[PDB]
């Protein structure tokens, strides 16, 4: 049995009645200027008409193909500081016993990175696959890269994360990575990934990459225009 | 949502397990300590039944097993889900003294006194914790009774004390077969 002295005291939150409860006012928060600036920058880029050379960066690899690309590319990460020091120690010992460094050091197969390096590789057609980060600021660094890869016949894909590519190449960020050569036990995997990129990204974005982006209205403007069209259709 | 790669991986795991179990069935006294570890998510009915009789449902459950032909066949069957080896006297003593629970009335009762052992196993001449340890370690005539009285040991995860490796399992699958005396390192770390 409950205590008879316990009482229910409901509060009425109508106008002129009891004090309003504490609600979630996050939609109307007076944000700091940097937060407001970055949000309004994103919104302005959504509002304006985006030319196709910039708008094509909104189409990237999906989750499965990006995961397969990173599954291949994590086997070809560059040398670490400790690995390079150990290799240099072995080469120094080989020089001391009178052998060339190539006798104890084999040919390396690493992911090629660095924007000028990758651009030169594309120009000399040494690159077999190119992955371009979708969030490079300034965008002019990579805006010509799909056209360069299309002119030189190189398979490319736009991928999410310069930080994700930096994890591959032991950096904070990486604007672009390229695969030129892999080992013979991964040549079949590289060919399959290249064919998967060609069939599942490039053919699917062949028509959408030429279209203008942006031009999206806000929520209240969209509702106003829908109401206006409904009124015009009714009358 | 479940991925198609998960479906294909699960089929290949089940076909490998079926081939291995068929090979074991076609091919047809020491003390071992067995710890249940994380393995394949889908378990075939015969390994599931062997885990039923070995009381190895939850992860980090440990049991003592007398090595016979039937028990060796069971251990070989449930090898991908267990880590087993030969425990030493220190491991057996520390396990029974620090994590020792008995099964009286179907209940988990900690071994806080010799009276529990005397009224539950006194018909077999086991009247103290040291008598229980002697039966387990020397594998006496009443090893089955002693091991059935002993509740499965709940071993701890050392990775839980460090935040960057908080979700990591302590024992990684892949090192199949008998660990022999190297199970004692795991027992010392987790007990």
């Amino acid at each position: 049995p409950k205590n008879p002295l316990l009482e229910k005291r409901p509060r009425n939150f109508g106008i002129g009645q009891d004090i309003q409860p504490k609600r979630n006012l996050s939609r109307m928060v007076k944000w700091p200027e940097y937060i407001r600036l970055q949000r309004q920058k994103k919104i302005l880029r959504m509002r304006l008409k985006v030319p196709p050379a910039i708008a094509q960066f909104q189409y990237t690899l999906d989750k499965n193909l990006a995961a397969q690309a990173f599954k291949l590319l994590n086997k070809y990460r560059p040398e670490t500081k400790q690995e390079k020091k150990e290799r240099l120690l072995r080469e120094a010992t080989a020089i001391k016993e009178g052998k060339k460094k190539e006798d104890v050091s084999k040919k390396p197969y690493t992911v090629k990175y660095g924007l000028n390096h990758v651009v030169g590789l594309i120009e000399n057609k040494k690159a077999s696959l190119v992955l371009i980060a979708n969030d490079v600021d300034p965008i002019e660094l990579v805006v010509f890269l799909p056209a360069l890869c299309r002119k030189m016949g190189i398979p490319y894909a736009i991928i999410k994360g310069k930080a994700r590519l930096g994890t591959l190449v032991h950096k904070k960020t990486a604007a672009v990575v390229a695969i030129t050569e892999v080992r013979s036990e991964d040549k079949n995997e590289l060919a399959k990934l290249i064919s998967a990129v060609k069939e599942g990204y490039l053919e699917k974005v062949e028509d959408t990459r030429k279209r203008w982006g942006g031009g999206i209205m806000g929520f209240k403007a969209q509702k106003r225009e829908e109401k206006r069209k409904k009124s015009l259709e009714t009358a | 949502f479940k991925r198609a790669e998960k479906y294909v991986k699960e089929y290949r795991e089940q076909e490998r397990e079926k081939i291995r179990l068929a090979r074991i069935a076609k091919q047809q006294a020491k003390l071992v300590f067995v710890i249940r570890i994380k393995g394949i998510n889908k378990i075939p009915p015969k390994p599931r039944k062997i885990l039923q009789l070995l009381r190895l449902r939850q992860i980090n459950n440990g049991v003592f097993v007398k090595v016979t032909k039937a028990t060796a066949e069971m251990i070989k069957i449930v090898e991908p889900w267990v880590a087993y080896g030969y425990p030493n006297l220190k491991s057996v003593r520390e396990l029974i003294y620090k994590r020792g629970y008995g099964k009286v009335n179907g209940q988990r009762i900690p071994l806080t006194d010799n009276a529990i052992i005397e009224e539950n196993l006194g018909k077999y001449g086991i009247i103290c914790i040291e008598d229980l340890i002697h039966e387990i370690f020397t594998v006496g005539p009443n090893f089955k009774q002693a091991a059935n009285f002993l509740w499965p040991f709940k071993l701890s995860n050392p990775n839980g004390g460090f935040r960057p490796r908080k979700f990591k399992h302590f024992i990684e699958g892949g090192d199949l077969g008998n660990r022999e005396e190297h199970i004692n390192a795991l027992i010392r770390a987790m007990n």
């Binding site: 499965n64 193909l65 397969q68 079949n188 995997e189 399959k192 990934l193 064919s195 998967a196 069939e199 599942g200 699917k204 | 949502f1 479940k2 198609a4 790669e5 479906y7 294909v8 991986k9 699960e10 089929y11 290949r12």
Partner: protein, 91 residues
């Protein structure tokens, strides 16, 4: 309303009737499914037909799963038109 038939090819070893039904039941209800298998040995021939009850559900599944890289295989997922569906396809 009108059922929709999806033809899927380049299936890897492991994508069989149970896995196909379990995967595409997430997209929608499946009424019929078959895997092209040889009668001599019982092995699959890496092709299957899945007819869903619902046509744009089938279209959505086909557009999602087309050119999917799965275990070294790039899946093919097309929609069989109702004019070209065999009346004895799902025997």
């Amino acid at each position: 309303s009108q059922p929709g038939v999806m033809y899927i090819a380049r299936l890897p070893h492991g994508f069989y009737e149970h896995e196909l039904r379990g995967y595409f039941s997430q997209f929608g209800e499946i009424t019929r499914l078959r895997v092209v298998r040889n009668k001599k040995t019982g092995a699959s021939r890496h092709r299957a037909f899945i007819e869903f009850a619902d046509a744009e559900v089938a279209d959505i599944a086909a557009r999602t799963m087309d050119k999917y890289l799965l275990f070294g295989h790039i899946l093919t997922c097309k929609i069989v038109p109702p004019a070209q569906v065999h009346p004895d396809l799902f025997k």
